[PDB]
Design a protein around this ligand. Sequence first.
Ligand SMILES: [Zn+2]
Ligand SMILES: [Zn+2]
Ligand SMILES: [Zn+2]
Ligand SMILES: [Zn+2]
Lengths: 124, 124, 124, 124
Amino acid sequence: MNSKQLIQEAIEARKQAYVPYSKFQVGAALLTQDGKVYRGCNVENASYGLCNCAERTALFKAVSEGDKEFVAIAIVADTKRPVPPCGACRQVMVELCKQDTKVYLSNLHGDVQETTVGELLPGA
Amino acid sequence: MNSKQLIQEAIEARKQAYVPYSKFQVGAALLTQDGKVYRGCNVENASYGLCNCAERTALFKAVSEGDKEFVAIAIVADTKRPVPPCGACRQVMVELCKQDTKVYLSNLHGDVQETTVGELLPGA
Amino acid sequence: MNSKQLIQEAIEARKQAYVPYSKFQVGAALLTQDGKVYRGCNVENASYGLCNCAERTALFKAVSEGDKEFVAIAIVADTKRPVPPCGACRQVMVELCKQDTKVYLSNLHGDVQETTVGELLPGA
Amino acid sequence: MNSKQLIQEAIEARKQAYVPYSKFQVGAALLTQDGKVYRGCNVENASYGLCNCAERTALFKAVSEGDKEFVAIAIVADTKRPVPPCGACRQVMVELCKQDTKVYLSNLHGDVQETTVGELLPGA
Ligand SMILES: [Zn+2]
Ligand SMILES: [Zn+2]
Ligand SMILES: [Zn+2]
Ligand SMILES: [Zn+2]
């Protein structure tokens, strides 16, 4: 599937977000080499340090089903420009994905920035 | 179901753990009010602080799929006595579950302790 | 020094808190067996999962100076009743302190609950 | 000062690390606009996810003492080439420091890479 369809999956994933403290909904969608998609959203805690990001939710759900080979991930939020993952998600993406895996950052108004896991974290 | 079946499901969940640094696999299985089961495992990182626990992987999976009403959780590891979740897991369960929700801590050699989300975190 | 003086140290520590997202200031003060006090406050991030608690700040600062034997800690916030540490701070306190180390939870209106590190985290 | 002196201070900071699980000591030293130095080290937990990095321990110490204006940081570990901070550390530095603040990554065998907070986290 193409980047436009994986972005839609992230738009759908995002609607499921648990965010009463920030009210800021993020969604992600991870695609395996076999073509399966894993959806993820952010999940907050009143104790802010325990908040979990969409990207990590999607990745942990894929690992938990025994899927380990990932080709791309799309990430979506209602920002002005597409905003990239926070530094802690980038680090997890580096652990679980290859340097060349595609990352499509997007917002709800059609903006798109394609990058890679490696480029997101210089020297990781 | 029953508690012995949710423990079996956690036993199976533990097999998917990603643990190359600690080598220590954990599994959890979460039961919804409707009787849906969600499995999780711990997922580690070379940066230790970014490691994620079994209980969280199950809970965040359920949230991401739209389930928010949980009746019980089982947690399993190769320990001597059954061990309770770490304090950060306890804090997540308090946010996402009711104080009366049932927690079965088990090992691979028979031992079972049953407790509750509330009893695990006094004053939370 | 007594619990009333360690609580004052926490009241002073709290004024230094970095919290633009929650605007909720916490302070702590850790006392060594030799009588030295370490002050700590919470420090937030726009990426909420990276927020750090007062208790952890105080503890990490004590370790970083080579102090390892702790007799008590006081914790203060502007809550109705004294509120206990979040589950992740409890876990760190367990790693670095003895089960019998004293914890004074307090607010700005004189309320005080004394407990212990061990009692804060059943079975840790 | 100079970069070689801040590196020496990180070399000293690393000696206080609490690392019984990874065994891997890291040090950091942070320099304020006024020329005050704050040292930190990594502090580990049996629950890997609760581990804290050197860079954070230094930064949170400075904040807790009222210093918020940072001109440079040095970070030191026993690696083959100098290694950059993990993504979660990068995200903290972005919040607490200016994009132009100077970062010296060093090892114990001569190697030095100088970079910046901004260069370490593109698009942050
Ligand atoms: Zn993130
Ligand atoms: Zn845990
Ligand atoms: Zn806390
Ligand atoms: Zn780090």
